[PDB]
Amino acid sequence: PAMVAGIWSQLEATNLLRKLLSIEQNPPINEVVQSGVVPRVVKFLSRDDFPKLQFEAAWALTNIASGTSENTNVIIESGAVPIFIQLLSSASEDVREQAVWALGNVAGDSPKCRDLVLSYGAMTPLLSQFNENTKLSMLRNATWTLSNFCRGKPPPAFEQTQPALPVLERLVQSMDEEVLTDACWALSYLSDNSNDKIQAVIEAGVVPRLIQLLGHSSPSVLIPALRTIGNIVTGDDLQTQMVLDQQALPCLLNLLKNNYKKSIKKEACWTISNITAQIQAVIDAGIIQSLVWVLQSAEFEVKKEAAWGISNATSGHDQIKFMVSQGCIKPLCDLLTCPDLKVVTVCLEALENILVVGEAEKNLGEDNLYAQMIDEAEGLEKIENLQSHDNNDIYDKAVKILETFWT
């Protein structure tokens, strides 16, 4: 409005500058760059002797880091990021926490910013920061900044984030919901797309704790923990087995059985489908009833995942007979009229696998029971209608099912 930048005690000015930037609506950031006093403020970061000015300066730049990637990039070009790194070793507790904050804002903005922060080796001082003497405010701030250090896609070089795993393992032991949430998010990022990464996460010994978090009374914690476990099962079988051996399935059942948040149910189904690829384990837990219940009653985003869970099991003989005895056919049949072609093909794949086992056990004088059951559930009509379908791939899949099991 009518500011005088008397920064050239000027702390008084730096405080106003900082407070102006921390305005909620229309923060006047770009006009601070017009005046061009950012390098002067960057010099104040290097004033260990006068930590109030240092604190108000760091805060003022943390605020500029918030928002858009530019004007975020001007803080990078000013050379403030390296200064924030060595501020993590300052004697002032308020400066250290502020330095942690600033680096979180920056790293979180983009993978380019993240990698830049990691290239300067911000990890090492950020970890030498968690201990018994660490307060709640610092504990929360640091775990969150760490969350952003691992966040983003493309992901950061695994081996840069790898030493976080030892610390993360301890952070999940906490009972603070803000710390637990971000820790699980951090872990969920470190398990995405690479069996090598998934293995490292298991070796840290976080799996048993994450199971307990599946029974947590707060979706903030429940979701990222459930996501991490979902990522662990997407890897190979020996990795998937480690979650099974930790009795994760009773916890997953609860999420389907009890009426949790719509999005949590669908994450649980997604996780179950990545197991069915060790199918024996899921059957013993009694998941199929609730999974069939979901496949009929629950809304489409969850049905889609349930369908995947069923089909993948039928891909991986005696087991299928139990699934049919749970009344899974009718559920699968009525989804053949679905608008989504991906789930229609998934259901065809499922019924085909069932019909194969139907023919198999028939040859042991009777008919194919499952083909009869499909016909009994109005399923044969729906399959015959797929011959008039737009998608050629579905016509083809529909025809080959008829020619093999109905002539």
Residue numbers in the entry: 78 to 85, 91 to 359, 364 to 402, 405 to 452, 456 to 498
What does the paper say about this structure?
NTRs of the importin-α/β class are conserved from yeast to plant cells and transport many distinct cargo proteins into the nucleus. The importin-α armadillo repeat domain binds to nuclear localization sequences (NLSs) of cargo proteins whilst an N-terminal α-helix makes direct contact to importin-β and is therefore called the importin-β-binding (IBB) domain (Cook et al., 2007). Whereas bipartite NLSs make contact to both binding sites, monopartite NLSs bind to either the major or the minor site (Marfori et al., 2011; Chang et al., 2013).
A crystal structure of the MOS6 armadillo repeat domain suggests strong conservation of the NLS-binding sites between MOS6 and four other Arabidopsis importin-αs. We attempted to crystallize ΔIBBMOS6 in complex with either HaRxL106 or an HaRxL106 peptide containing the NLS, but we did not obtain protein crystals of sufficient quality for structure determination. Like other importin-α proteins from yeast, mammals and rice, ΔIBBMOS6 forms 10 armadillo repeats with strong conservation of residues that contribute to the major and minor NLS-binding sites (Marfori et al., 2011). This revealed that essentially all amino acids of rice importin-α1a, that make direct contact to the SV40NLS at the major and minor NLS-binding sites, are conserved in MOS6. We found that residues contributing to the MOS6 NLS-binding site are strongly conserved in importin-α1, -α2, -α4 and -α6 whilst these residues are less conserved in importin-α9. However, when only the H3 helices of ARM repeats 1–8 that contribute the NLS-binding sites are considered, the sequence identity is approximately 45% (Wirthmueller et al., 2013). This conservation of the H3 helices allowed us to build homology models for the armadillo repeat domains of other Arabidopsis importin-αs based on the ΔIBBMOS6 structure. Superposition of individual models with the ΔIBBMOS6 structure revealed an almost complete conservation of the major and minor NLS-binding sites in five out of six importin-αs expressed in rosette leaves (importin-α1, -α2, -α3, -α4 and -α6).
